[PDB]
Amino acid sequence: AGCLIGAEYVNNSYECDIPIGAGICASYQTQSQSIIAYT
Amino acid sequence: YFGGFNFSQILPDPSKPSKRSFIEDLLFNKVTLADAGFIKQYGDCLGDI
Numbered sequence A: 001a002g003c004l005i006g007a008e009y010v011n012n013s014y015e016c017d018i019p020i021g022a023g024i025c026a027s028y029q030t031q032s033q034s035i036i037a038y039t
Numbered sequence B: 001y002f003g004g005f006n007f008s009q010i011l012p013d014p015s016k017p018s019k020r021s022f023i024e025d026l027l028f029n030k031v032t033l034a035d036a037g038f039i040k041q042y043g044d045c046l047g048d049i
């Protein structure tokens, strides 16, 4: 759905918090406080 | 083995990467999509062909 700027992609899988696009979600996780993107 | 019942056309097969069954493959091939911009298309739209 375009490209994301400001969130680091991780190789994990949790429940969807903030929906972005085709199967990608974003969340605010502790592992320093930062925004991550995941499937 | 499920008592003789044949579920091989509705259960998925790992041969194809999009793990869909035979009936699902027929249903997905039958409906001709309009090819909307749910995939990015501006690189195609830039090159006039």
Ligand SMILES: *[C@@H]1O[C@H](CO)[C@@H](O)[C@H](O)[C@H]1NC(C)=O
Pocket (backbone or CB within 6 Å): B006, B008, B009
């Ligand atoms: C029915 O089951 C057999 C296995 O006993 C399988 O070889 C066959 O392909 C199945 N039928 C269809 C149409 O897939």
